[PDB]
Amino acid sequence: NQYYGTGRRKSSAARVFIKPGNGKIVINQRSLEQYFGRETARMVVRQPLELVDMVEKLDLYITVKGGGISGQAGAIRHGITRALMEYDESLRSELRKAGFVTRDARQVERKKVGLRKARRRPQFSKR
Amino acid sequence: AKQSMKAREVKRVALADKYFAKRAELKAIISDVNARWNAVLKLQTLPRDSSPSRQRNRCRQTGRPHGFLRKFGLSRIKVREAAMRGEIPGLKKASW
Amino acid sequence: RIRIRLKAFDHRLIDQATAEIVETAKRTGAQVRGPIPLPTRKERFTVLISPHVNKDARDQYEIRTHLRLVDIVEPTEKTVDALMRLDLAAGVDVQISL
Amino acid sequence: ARIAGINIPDHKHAVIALTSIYGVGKTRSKAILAAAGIAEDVKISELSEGQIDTLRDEVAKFVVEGDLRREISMSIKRLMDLGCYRGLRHRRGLPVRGQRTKTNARTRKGPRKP
Amino acid sequence: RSLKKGPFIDLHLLKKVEKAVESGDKKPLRTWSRRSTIFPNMIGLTIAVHNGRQHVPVFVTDEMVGHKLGEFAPTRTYR
Amino acid sequence: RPKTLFEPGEMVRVNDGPFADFNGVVEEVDYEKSRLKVSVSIFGRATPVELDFSQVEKA
Amino acid sequence: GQKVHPNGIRLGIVKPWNSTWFANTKEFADNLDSDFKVRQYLTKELAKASVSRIVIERPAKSIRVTIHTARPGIVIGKKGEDVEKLRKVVADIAGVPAQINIAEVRKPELDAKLVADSITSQLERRVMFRRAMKRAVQNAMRLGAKGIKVEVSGRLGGAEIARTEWYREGRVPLHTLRADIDYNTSEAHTTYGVIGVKVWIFKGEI
RNA sequence: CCGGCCGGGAACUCAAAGGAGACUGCCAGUGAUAAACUGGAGGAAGGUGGGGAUGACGUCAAGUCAUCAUGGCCCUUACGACCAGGGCUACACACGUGCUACAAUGGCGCAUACAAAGAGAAGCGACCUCGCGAGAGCAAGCGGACCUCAUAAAGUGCGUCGUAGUCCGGAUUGGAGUCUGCAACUCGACUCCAUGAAGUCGGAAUCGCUAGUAAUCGUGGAUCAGAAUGCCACGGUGAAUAC
RNA sequence: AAGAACCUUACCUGGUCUUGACAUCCACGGAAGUUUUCAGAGAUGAGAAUGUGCCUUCGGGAACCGUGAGACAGGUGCUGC
């Protein structure tokens, strides 16, 4: 298949193309280096793009949709796991063992009434 | 209760909507000058209750000054009564 | 080209109505687009339950406008003769567009 | 480059040296900044007469320092001389712009006294 | 603190001030409205501003031109 | 050309269309929209529809 | 005090909405105020007609009001003259053409609002409240509802200290959402004070 | 036009309807051969999957007669009713709640990223022109998956500051645009140009939080002519620790 | 209080009350209305110009407007014990 994006994390659904050769991430027909190359936390989110280990013979074009950067990395990671299962079902045990096939269902909780945030409660005076 | 306030609100809505707000609009577009003033003095002469900003929104069932919800047209307690009864269409308890 | 837009507060009502319009288009035989699901507009109202002092005590409310577009490709005089009171649902508000 | 102040720039910004000079707001600083257009944290050695003349004419063209002290003191003073309440109510020191005085305004009222 | 499309004065106050100038001498012109800017036509007149049951007499000088009638009336009483 | 002059506020009733035997009053016309705004009662339901002389055949 | 309205919590799942129309933001408050005035006129004119629910459904131009009534004869009147006077009346309140249809409330001892106004009118006519409540619960249990709970509140039997007395038979599973529970409240303006009657009737599990 | 833009296609994201799925279903070990517990496979989710809505009989004669209804009592040429200016915004101070701080894990400047949820017709208002600017002029598109609010900010990448009381920004009346012109005096928010206070991490004490949580960063809505640092929602980054 | 510049909005001044701002009646008169002039801080007065259409089995009926007496209104007045 054409290695299109699948897989979701937080508010992100993946839109990446991966194709054989050597790898350099380019986004919206523009470079990762021009956009965000030497960015810190970008190594932290580039590592899950490669944690699927399915980069070693490929080229990367990323224009994923939704969320922020780490959520986008989670969606791209889940997508390369799905691409791997669809391509050959053999590494399903190792991908589940690494924990990559699980969709991270952790999502932000709603603001609740009488509470300033989801769980944070207004300061209480005893007297 | 508070029947005078509803009579007052009736008077302001009647002066603003029907008697005026053609004259007041023409006076305001003259009053902004673009290349003491007669239009401002005529706008002074027009009655005070003709201003739309003197209308205070009131509950249509009770006339409560505070707590009005303008989609329903009622204050919060009457809205809750009609929602629980079923009189407000499509309104149910949100549970997201 | 004649696109019909349908809004309701009840999804069962709007499915029954969009089936009636889609069946009418099929009975004429002109091409129709499907009942296209356009996003539900949800309005949330948070009203205080107590008349007096209780701020934290509130209850939440939602109105859901369900929406569907049917978009008849070819208008027909047999359709236009049959359209009169074809919806027959008070909950469904229908807006045609040429 | 001291014109109508107690502060002379000392290897620092002209715009904040004038800003530390009383009676002058930020826009005269901004205008002299646009006139300069270099780093102003360059040294004060060879202070430029061009900078001295430009800042003097610009503070002269806009509101001059000391009119602020004049405005407060004479507004209080002449409405006291007339006996109108505006001089007294500007004299007492509580803020008249509209700030609450029920629990705040300690900047105008100093430290608390019981 | 006001638009530059127009200066503001009450129309009854403008009429009463121009009648005061046409008379050339007047007693305190009792004005209930405080939201009126002092005109240069007001200088040399005594305008009596309303602040409740007390009655404040304000005599215009040349300084108090851009200011309204209200700031020369004390609204509240303090120790 | 039949009825080439266009008059605002003119009432036409289409027997073939669903608006037959229906009476309505047009208080507001949106000239700034550049589409004729009448609360046309369609299928026995009165809702505002934008309309044009090219869009609907005049009766 | 701590209890949710059963109709309100069940308004989409089991119970139907009383007013069924679509309105945008311009027509919503006007439609609802017209509805409150239509319901108030119909209640006060049909106080003796045993009214249960008023269902208002409008296709924008027209208005249709369906009155659920235990006695259709009194509201229908002589050859529809009474219904025609209410039709002209609802037309003048609504400002749009009206049509009034009539639904018969078979088994009025199961309907909540009807047994509520029965206990309320009895309490006005000085029937003892224990007797009226026991008559209501036994009549509903006899006619075939699975459960009935009747709560009376305030100034009971001409006493200064208010009390709330509830008589319960069968099941009223209020916490479950499937249960069709018609709940209604009626208000008695007795000479010593206001007495409030609350009825829940659990007819089946849907 | 290298803009899905455009033929096309419906394949994905997606929208919103209907289903499937998770029940200790399966396996082991324990237990009493029971309920059940502890692990494991599968699976997206595993043992209330996460959160919401749901608050039993009653308690405090708890709160609301001022949302509305209401028993009794009182006023009815006044305790009714209209108007204009005032007060609810005052201040010797003392508590409870939130904002911004006390910098360098930060400021300032430039360039560049990635979102969700809402609202909108006497409304949302692009675009272009003119303003340091709040804004003004002209004004298309829109009752909305279309147009508009609306180039998210934290993030980053280069500089620069390396005590500066810093952009932390409090402070009377000045110079202005807007709202409604009853009308910004008392008493609007706003780039305001006003002067650059206090504070160098806070005594006794005391509060919130167990995972997408705290913390931090923005966005929207109701109320509303204008008037949030409040309330109600929304997403971004994302801990520490439970012996 | 999901919004105090006026309004909201009770509490000091100027006017009003037997129909009150707000409903229902009864009598009389006038279409309702729109444009203005003077006075006043202002609902308030004091005036002019036009509109008697609409309709009644015209022995004149309207939504209304104003006045005149009584029932009545009106109360964000008290007691959540």
Say which CATH number the domain at C65 has: 3.30.70.600
CB-based contact G52:G43 (threshold 8 Å): no
Cβ-in-10-Å burial (0-12, 13-18, 19+) of A78 comes to buried
- Vertex E20: Cα angle to E15 and E25 (nearest 5): 175
* Per-residue flag: C59 CB under 7 A of strand H: yes
D36: DSSP letter: H
Assigned CATH class of G107-206: alpha beta
Test the G interface: residue of C6, C7, C9 with most G CBs within 10 Å: C9
CB-based contact C13:C89 (threshold 8 Å): yes
What backbone phi and psi angles, to 5 degrees, belong to F54? Answer: -75, -30
Question: How far is Cα of residue A76 from the mean position of the Cα atoms in its chain?
Answer: 4
- Measured CA to CA, the distance from residue G187 to residue C48 in angstroms comes to 24
What is the chain C residue with the closest CA to A114? Answer: C56
Hey, which chains touch B, using 3+ CB pairs under 8 Å? Answer: C, E, G
Q: How far is C75 from chain G (nearest CA, A)?
A: 25
- The SS3 assignment for D62 reads coil
Give me the long-range contacts of F51-57 (CB less than 8 A, separation at least 24).
Answer: F51/C98, F52/C98, F53/F6, F55/C98, F56/C98, F56/F14, F56/F17, F57/F14
Q: Write the CA distances from G27 to B72, D15, F42, integer angstroms.
A: 10, 60, 17
- The SS3 assignment for B10 reads helix
- The SS3 assignment for E27 reads coil
Beta-bridge mates of residue C6: C68, C94
**CATH architecture label of G16-106:** 2-Layer Sandwich (3.30)
Taking CB atoms and an 8 Å limit, are E5 and B41 in contact across chains?
no
* Per-residue flag: C19 CB under 7 A of strand H: no
- Measured CA to CA, the distance from residue A11 to residue A105 in angstroms comes to 10
CB-based contact G197:G116 (threshold 8 Å): yes
CA of D39 to C1' of H168 (A): 24
- Measured CA to CA, the distance from residue A59 to residue A31 in angstroms comes to 13
- Measured CA to CA, the distance from residue C30 to residue C72 in angstroms comes to 8
The residue type of G204 is G
B61: DSSP letter: T
The residue type of D54 is T
* Per-residue flag: B80 CB under 7 A of strand I: no
Number of independent structural domains in chain C: 1
Write the DSSP string, C17-84.
Answer: HHHHHHHHHHHHT--B---EEEEEEEEEEEEESSSSS-SS-EEEEEEEEEEEE--BSS--HHHHHH-T
What is the DSSP pairing of strand G193-205 with strand A30-31? unpaired
> Which nucleotides in chain I lie less than 7 Å from some protein C-beta?
1-4, 6-10, 12-13, 21-23, 34-36, 39-43, 73-76
HEC assignment per residue over chain G: CCCCCHHHHCCCCCCCCCEECCCCCCCHHHHHHHHHHHHHHHHHHCCCCCEEEEEEECCCCCEEEEEEECCHHHHHCCCCHHHHHHHHHHHHHHCCCEEEEEEECCCCCCCHHHHHHHHHHHHHCCCCHHHHHHHHHHHHHHHCCCEEEEEEECCCCCCCCCCEEEEEEECCCCCCCCEEEEEEEEEEEECCEEEEEEEEEEEEEC
The residue type of C6 is L
Max Cα separation, chain B? 59
- Measured CA to CA, the distance from residue B6 to residue B60 in angstroms comes to 9
- Measured CA to CA, the distance from residue G155 to residue F26 in angstroms comes to 57
Q: Write the CA distances from G90 to F11, F44, G38, G63, integer angstroms.
A: 29, 19, 6, 9
Write the DSSP string, chain A.
Answer: --B----EETTEE--EEEEES----EETTEEHHHHHSS-TTHHHHHHHHHHTS--TTEEEEE--EES-HHHHHHHHHHHHHHHHHHH-GGGHHHHHHHT-SS-----PPPP-TTSSSSS--------
Per-residue CB contacts under 7 A with strand I, chain E residues 29-68: 30-33, 52-53
- The residue ranges of every structural domain in chain G are 16-106, 107-206
* Per-residue flag: E2 CB under 7 A of strand H: yes
Structure tokens at A112: 């609740």
CB-based contact G120:G188 (threshold 8 Å): yes
What is the chain B residue with the closest CA to G6? Answer: B84
CA of A3 to C1' of H78 (A): 87
CA of B96 to C1' of H52 (A): 6
* Per-residue flag: B71 CB under 7 A of strand I: no
Structure tokens at E54: 């007390």
- Measured CA to CA, the distance from residue B85 to residue G185 in angstroms comes to 10
Query: By C-alpha distance, which of A84, A79, A106 is closest to A95?
Result: A84
- Measured CA to CA, the distance from residue G21 to residue G9 in angstroms comes to 20
Q: Write the CA distances from G55 to B80, B85, G17, integer angstroms.
A: 18, 12, 8
**Region for residue G87 given its phi and psi (left: phi exceeds 0; alpha: psi -120 to 50; beta: otherwise):** alpha
CA of A124 to C1' of H230 (A): 17
Test the F interface: residue of G20, G25, G31, G61 with most F CBs within 10 Å: G61
Please report the sign of the dihedral spanned by the C-alpha atoms of residue G96, residue G100, residue G105, residue G108.
positive
C 37-96 residues with CB below 8 A of B? 42-45, 47-49, 51, 59-65, 91
Residues 6+ apart with CB under 8 A from E23: none
Q: Resolution for this model in angstroms, one decimal place?
A: 3.2
In chain D, what are the helix, strand and coil shares in percent, each to the nearest 5? 50, 0, 50
What is the chain C residue with the closest CA to G8? Answer: C61
Query: By C-alpha distance, which of C18, C27, C13, C9 is closest to C71?
Result: C18
B16: DSSP letter: I
What is the chain D residue with the closest CA to E70? Answer: D86
Q: Torsion angle of alpha carbons D93, D94, D99, D103, nearest 10°?
A: 130
Query: By C-alpha distance, which of C74, C70, C71 is closest to C30?
Result: C74
Sheet of E29-31, strands arranged across = E29-31, E46-51, E54-59
**Region for residue B47 given its phi and psi (left: phi exceeds 0; alpha: psi -120 to 50; beta: otherwise):** beta
Structure tokens at G37: 């005035």
From the alpha carbon of B75, which nucleotide's C1' atom is closest?
Answer: H67
What is the b/e burial string over F25-47, where b = at least 16 CB atoms within 10 angstroms of the residue's CB? Answer: eeeeeeeeeeebbbbbbbbbbbb
CB-based contact B68:G43 (threshold 8 Å): no
CB-based contact G61:F23 (threshold 8 Å): no
